[PDB]
Amino acid sequence: RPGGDTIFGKIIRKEIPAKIIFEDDRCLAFHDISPQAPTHFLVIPKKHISQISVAEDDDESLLGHLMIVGKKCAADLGLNKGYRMVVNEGSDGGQSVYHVHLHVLGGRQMHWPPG
Amino acid sequence: GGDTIFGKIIRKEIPAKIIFEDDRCLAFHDISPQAPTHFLVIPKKHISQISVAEDDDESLLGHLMIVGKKCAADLGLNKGYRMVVNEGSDGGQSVYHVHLHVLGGRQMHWPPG
Numbered sequence: 001r002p003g004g005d006t007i008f009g010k011i012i013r014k015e016i017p018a019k020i021i022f023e024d025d026r027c028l029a030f031h032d033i034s035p036q037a038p039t040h041f042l043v044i045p046k047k048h049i050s051q052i053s054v055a056e057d058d059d060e061s062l063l064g065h066l067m068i069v070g071k072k073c074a075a076d077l078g079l080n081k082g083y084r085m086v087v088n089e090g091s092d093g094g095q096s097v098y099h100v101h102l103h104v105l106g107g108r109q110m111h112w113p114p115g
Numbered sequence: 116g117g118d119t120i121f122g123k124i125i126r127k128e129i130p131a132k133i134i135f136e137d138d139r140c141l142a143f144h145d146i147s148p149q150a151p152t153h154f155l156v157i158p159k160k161h162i163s164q165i166s167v168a169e170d171d172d173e174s175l176l177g178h179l180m181i182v183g184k185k186c187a188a189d190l191g192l193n194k195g196y197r198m199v200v201n202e203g204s205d206g207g208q209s210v211y212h213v214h215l216h217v218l219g220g221r222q223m224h225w226p227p228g
């Protein structure tokens with residue numbers, strides 16, 4: 001199916017609700033249901049890729065597009081003091097949804113280390 | 116390139132533990148590691164921060180991520196890892212040259228700072 005089997009595929013196909021910030025032919029940005037900062041959203045590809053560790057070389061433009069859309073949405077949402085982008089891979093990364101996605105968190109001071 | 120310590124590293128003016136290099140990026144271990152494995156992937160093009168990257172940079176930015184995941188595999192991070200890009204003061208960005216952090220070798224926690 002276009003978008004894959006995960007809950008994010010269901011969001012892509014409008015089968016379950018989401019608070020969408022931006023949508024184009026390649027990706028979708030929507031707010032996280034369990035925000036870890038005053039603003040916390042996800043940017044995901046419409047093509048299903050399970051996790052960054054299995055992305056193909058020809059996925060480079062798409063992955064870069066997630067970041068460009070992330071920074072554009074951050075600006076549009078007024079995160080003028082900055083933000084943090086995160087990709088969680090696998091068990092040590094704490095990954096819970098196996099559809100590649102970029103977190104964007106802001107609206108407060110982010111601390112170091114990043115988890 | 117550029118007028119930061121990362122520019123000096125790219126130009127080979129100061130040492131760094133280099134993991135991978137090509138014509139457009141460089142990966143090297145972070146000098147202040149926050150996990151048993153903690154390295155950076157940076158473009159050779161001086162983009163000061165992700166907020167000023169242009170559409171034309173999309174494939175370069177994606178290239179950083181692909182290089183990052185390949186380096187992670189080569190460094191034996193088979194249990195996973197976390198990638199991070201910091202922007203500005205709230206993001207805790209330490210150097211104004213875009214850089215992708217890759218951290219692994221321990222459980223990464225939530226929230227991510």
Ligand SMILES: Nc1ncnc2c1ncn2[C@@H]1O[C@H](COP(=O)(O)O)[C@@H](O)[C@H]1O
Pocket residue numbers: 007018031032033034035088093094095096097098
């Ligand atoms: N239905 C949903 N809508 C929005 N965000 C979600 C939904 N289900 C899970 N998430 C978020 O997706 C992320 C998945 O975890 P991880 O794979 O570590 O990034 C978490 O931040 C969740 O809160």
